Ligand binder design. Structure first.
Ligand SMILES: Nc1ncnc2c1ncn2[C@@H]1O[C@H](COP(=O)(O)OP(=O)(O)O)[C@@H](O)[C@H]1O
Ligand SMILES: Nc1ncnc2c1ncn2[C@@H]1O[C@H](COP(=O)(O)OP(=O)(O)O)[C@@H](O)[C@H]1O
Ligand SMILES: [Mg+2]
Ligand SMILES: [Mg+2]
Lengths: 300, 300
């Protein structure tokens, strides 16, 4: 049930961006942290990624927990931060992004698990939380329907694609990126993978979920009060969960369609990862401090 | 593993159609049959339906076996016969058709089963076999993939919709009819319902399938040699199955993408129903004799 938070700077661009006050301190693998100072403000996520680090680098860290799902664990990955800061890239960049890398890492792990009596079934769903209203990105009423027993969570009338072939993954993925690149800015996209694997050998029925979330523009209709509502809620929910006496603390899971949606892949034995995508361009140090300040506090 | 065949006349129309040589003999519930003579040729399905009988009438007979799926049984329903003879009506006529009536009858049976500790899960798929090439009517590679163990049968990359709400059934159904009414003539549409219901009480895991098939125009590209290929194959497969020493007889299930597709919901403990939709218009007595002759022989 561990929470981790990583910062993630990206390289400047040609539209805007200059210099850099974003001093990324060297990763201190003793305290296990990794500070960084903006100008001077201090922050220290669970590992920082400067523009130099690539998706592969980023996923090599993550890959670790994401394979837990195959262990029936649940996982949440969040790409938070002002718009244009990279959230969709980190998540869906073709071949590279966390989602593409997850379906792969997971895929490979299974092929190699089959050989161990095991065997897995995989289906997923892609939806989006725009204005607290779930939309089915893979295709009405879509209400989060929980199962207090299995601790599962469905969503009514939501397309759930069987990730059977890589051709599918290809389509879905392709489609997912055409969708979140350049709306996608003012919403929360969510890729959900359901690892359901039996195993004749030990009959160890195993189920687990991964929720790869691309939060909406934390940047500074009235979906605006909304985005700040969800994002802030998530903040409070993560925080509250990453709190010592929290098992006994009252978390407002239902105070937002998102958190409520992933409340099960957010509790008990769950894995949550917050990615604070920030830009190095001094022309965003204002909205950047905010992002680093979101995580910094949320991670306690 | 019983096979039944019903004829099904429909009322004439304004485009064509006159009189009637289609003498429908009275249902003889002793021999259990029901002859009928065309002019004089004799035929005797498992019950005939003249234009007077409605979808409700037709389904009240069928409804019987279709509830078997809830008993883990598998079912196949075929609407065969020259084009314009009613196949799509019998199957998808709004609210009335066999498919709409099945999702209902099944739906009601479950609500009433839940109350008996039971509980069911339902998903379906709608695809079409046009030119031996499976198309996903609910949305690449679609290969029939069998499971010699569970006796199940998937179809790669094929959309499988969770029949969760009646809103969905509504959409799917609506969409299904826009699709097969006035192409749909030169193909085989197939609605597949998967009744998967556990039950905490007796933990009796139960799975069953229903395949509601709208065969292509048996009427008299080169999809033509194809349609005659599939239809004829199905003929031979039904026949061969409805044969005494058939358990020991070699059935060419794979000699057609359709039969091969439903080979499991066609054998062992399966329920197959053939519907020979014919017109009363003397202006089709030629292509009609053929239909009645298809069933007549196939049913032995
Ligand atoms: N890690 C990265 N490496 C290279 N370019 C990046 C990276 N992250 C973001 N970008 C670029 O920044 C721009 C913003 O894209 P996007 O990921 O959608 O940002 P955001 O999701 O924050 O709005 C894109 O042109 C993208 O290619
Ligand atoms: N049982 C029936 N009652 C009333 N009309 C029918 C019936 N069966 C078919 N029809 C009519 O016949 C026409 C042919 O429709 P369709 O069912 O698609 O036939 P087919 O599937 O054989 O091509 C339609 O206009 C339909 O409404
Ligand atoms: Mg974006
Ligand atoms: Mg038709």
């Amino acid at each position: 049930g561990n929470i981790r938070v990583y910062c993630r700077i990206r390289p400047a661009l040609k539209n805007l961006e200059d210099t850099s006050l974003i001093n990324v301190n060297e990763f201190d693998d003793n305290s296990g942290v990794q500070s960084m100072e903006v100008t001077v403000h201090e922050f220290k996520f669970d590992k920082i990624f400067d523009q130099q680090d690539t998706n592969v680098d980023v996923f090599k860290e993550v890959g670790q927990l994401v394979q837990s799902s195959l262990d029936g664990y649940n996982v949440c990955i969040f790409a938070y931060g002002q718009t244009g800061s990279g959230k969709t890239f980190t998540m869906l960049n073709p071949g590279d992004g966390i989602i593409p890398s997850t379906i792969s890492h997971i895929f490979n792990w299974i092929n190699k698990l089959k050989t161990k009596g095991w065997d897995y079934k995989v289906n997923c769903e892609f939806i989006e939380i725009y204005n607290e209203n779930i939309v089915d990105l893979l295709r009405l009423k879509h209400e989060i329907r929980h199962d207090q027993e299995t601790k599962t969570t469905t969503i009514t009338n939501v397309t759930s694609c069987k990730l059977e072939s890589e051709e599918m993954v290809e389509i879905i993925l392709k489609k997912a990126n055409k969708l979140r690149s350049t709306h996608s800015s003012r919403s929360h996209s969510i890729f959900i993978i359901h690892l359901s694997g039996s195993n004749a050998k030990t009959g160890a029925h195993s189920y687990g979920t991964l929720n790869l979330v691309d939060l909406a523009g934390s940047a500074r209709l009235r979906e605006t009060q909304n985005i700040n509502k969800s994002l802030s809620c998530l903040g409070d929910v993560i925080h509250a969960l990453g709190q010592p006496d929290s098992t006994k603390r009252h978390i407002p899971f239902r105070n937002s369609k998102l958190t409520y949606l992933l409340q099960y892949s957010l509790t008990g034995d769950s894995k949550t990862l917050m990615f604070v995508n920030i830009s190095p361009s001094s022309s965003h140090i204002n909205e950047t401090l905010n992002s680093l300040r979101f995580a910094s506090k949320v991670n306690s």
